[PDB]
Structures are given as C-alpha cells and as structure tokens.
A paper describes a structure:
F-spondin is a multi-domain extracellular matrix (ECM) protein and a contact-repellent molecule that directs axon outgrowth and cell migration during development. F-spondin is an extracellular matrix (ECM) protein with multiple domains, including an N-terminal domain (reelin_N domain), an F-spondin (FS) domain and six thrombospondin type 1 repeats (TSRs). The reelin_N domain and the F-spondin domain (FS domain) comprise a proteolytic fragment that interacts with the cell membrane and guides the projection of commissural axons to floor plate. In this paper, we present the crystal structure of human F-spondin FS domain.
The core of the FS domain has an 8-stranded β-sandwich fold, with strands β4, β1, β8, and β7 forming one β-sheet and strands β3, β2, β5 and β6 forming the other sheet. The first major variation of the FS domain, as compared to a common C2 domain, is its long linker (38 amino acids) between β2 and β3 strands, which actually forms two anti-parallel α-helices, packed against the β3/β2/β5/β6 sheet. The second variation is its long linker (51 amino acids) between the β7 and β8 strands. The three consecutive cysteines (C199, C200 and C202) before the β1 strands form three disulfide bonds with C336 and C340 from the β6-β7 loop, and C415 after the β8 strand at the C-terminal region, respectively. None of these disulfide bonds is located within the core of the β-sandwich domain. They are all at the bottom of the FS domain and are associated with N- and C-termini, especially the N-terminus, where they seem to help define and stabilize the globular FS domain. There is one N-linked glycosylation site (N214) at the end of the β1 strand in the FS domain. The common pentasaccharide core of the linked glycans is visible in the electron densities. Associated with the short strands at the top of the FS domain, there is a solvent-accessible Ca2+-binding site, formed from D325 (from β5-β6 loop), D354 (from β7' short strand) and D358 (right after β7' short strand). All three aspartic acids are from the two highly conserved and characteristic FS domain "repeats", P322SPDW and D354AGTD (in F-spondin). Both D325 and D354 interact with the Ca2+ ion as bidentate ligands involving both carboxyl groups with bond distances of 2.49 Å/2.53 Å and 2.38 Å/2.46 Å, respectively. The homology of its core structure to a common Ca2+- and lipid-binding C2 domain suggests that the F-spondin FS domain may be responsible for part of the membrane targeting of F-spondin in its regulation of axon development.
Author numbering: 192 to 427
Write the structure that this text describes.
Amino acid sequence: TDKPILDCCACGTAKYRLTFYGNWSEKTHPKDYPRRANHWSAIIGGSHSKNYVLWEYGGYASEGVKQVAELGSPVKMEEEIRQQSDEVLTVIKAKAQWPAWQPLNVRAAPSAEFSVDRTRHLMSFLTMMGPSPDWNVGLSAEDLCTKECGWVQKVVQDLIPWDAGTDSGVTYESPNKPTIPQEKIRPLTSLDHPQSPFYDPEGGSITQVARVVIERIARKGEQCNIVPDNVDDIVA
Ligand SMILES: *[C@@H]1O[C@H](CO)[C@@H](O[C@@H]2O[C@H](CO)[C@@H](O[C@@H]3O[C@H](CO)[C@@H](O)[C@H](O)[C@@H]3O)[C@H](O)[C@H]2NC(C)=O)[C@H](O)[C@H]1NC(C)=O
Ligand SMILES: [Ca+2]
C-alpha cells in the first residue's frame, strides 16, 4: 500500500477571515419565531487536514457536536479539536449572538481568522441555532487550496440548518427528547414535520438562515501558483 498522493499542491501558508452573517429573524422566518430566547451559540471549528472530520452530512455527531447542538456549549467540541494535535492548524472561535439577529450598524457580524498550509488546507465549523432541539449551521471540509496550486481568494456560502441526530423535538422550543440510537446528520427540509417552523405544504427550499464569507487576508512563504495572483498580501 502506497501513501495517498497529496491533493493540495499550493505552497507556503495563507490566512483567512471567516465572517458569519445571521439572516434568521422574526421578519425573515416568522413561524413560531422564538422572540425572547433566539440566539446563535458560539462558533467553534478549525482548519484541519483530511484526517480529521469535525462533522459531515451522513455522519454521526461526536459528543462535542451533540453538546453544541443541544446545549450551545463549544467546550467539549474544542477539547475534541485540540485532541487531534497536528491534524488541526488553527482552532476557530467566535462569540455567541444574543439576540440572533441585528442590523450591521448595530452589531458587527462575528468573525475569526484562521491559517491553512498544504496539509491543513480544509476548514470546518458549526454554531447552534437556539433554542432548538439539535439544529446547527456550518461548513464541513471547505477546501481553501486550488487546482492551480494557489489559495482561494473568497468563498461566499448561504446556509440552512442541519439536524445533529441527537434530539427528536419538532420545533424550536420542544421539550427534550433523546434520539436513541443517534441518527445521521442531515439538512432540515420544508416537509420534515407539519409543526416544524420551516414547514410549507408546497415544499421548496428553506429560506437561508445565514451566510458565511471567507476571505483571504494574507499569504506567507514562497508561492507556486500556476496562474497569476498579484494581490499584494504576501507578508515578509
Ligand atoms: C443575509 O445577510 C447578509 C449579510 O447582511 C446579506 O448580504 C448582503 O446583501 C446585500 C444585498 O442586498 C449586499 O448589499 C448590496 O450589494 C450589491 C453589490 O453587488 C450592491 O449592488 C447593492 O447596492 C448593495 O450594496 C451586501 O453585499 C451583502 N453582504 C454580504 C454578502 O456580506 C444577505 O442578502 C442576507 N440575505 C437575506 C435573504 O436577507
Ligand atoms: Ca433532531
């Protein structure tokens, strides 16, 4: 058996800003909106290698993912991430948001910086939509390395909630109801359950609840991109 070939051919390191924009408010998602309790939990994630999976669709929630989903607590997730030692480059953290939605002139969108290198060229994170039985948003294994042996300049992604598979409640404020055995992580849909706040008998996509912006802010070290990248962001 040979070691698998390297998937990322970019050189040196790159630094990114992750900014998280909530779009989940009583105005955009009126049905049973939790007017008093609504929040986003702290953001937790990391830049990492292919050898570590924080969460993935069709995967089972780790203990740390479960505690984010149910408690809004990033503490066990952060322990799990740090236990991966060299498979993780940067630990990503940003603060909780109470209430969940404000205009940008009122409150800055939470952000964090992270680094990538040839081996830790992926990024994952999650945050809990609260209150909820077990509903998060996030990205899993977003790749910052390009085929051209460079580093992506900007990624913009709109998000819908996903279900961590650990609690069977049907709406934001449902009583605790352990899902046993735990089920696979899956996205929410507009036909999950008639009491779901996202239910629409006509089906169709769920209105996005957040947008994430990932922007490159620096590169370091000799570069080996096969197309020009003359952005003046290489630090000496
Ligand atoms: C979810 O929240 C995000 C963050 O506020 C929203 O993104 C922002 O949306 C507006 C579009 O109305 C963007 O401003 C506009 O940009 C275009 C540039 O092409 C310009 O022509 C307009 O005059 C205006 O300046 C803004 O760039 C964008 N912010 C981002 C991406 O960070 C998003 O629309 C929200 N979605 C919903 C459905 O509420
Ligand atoms: Ca669930």
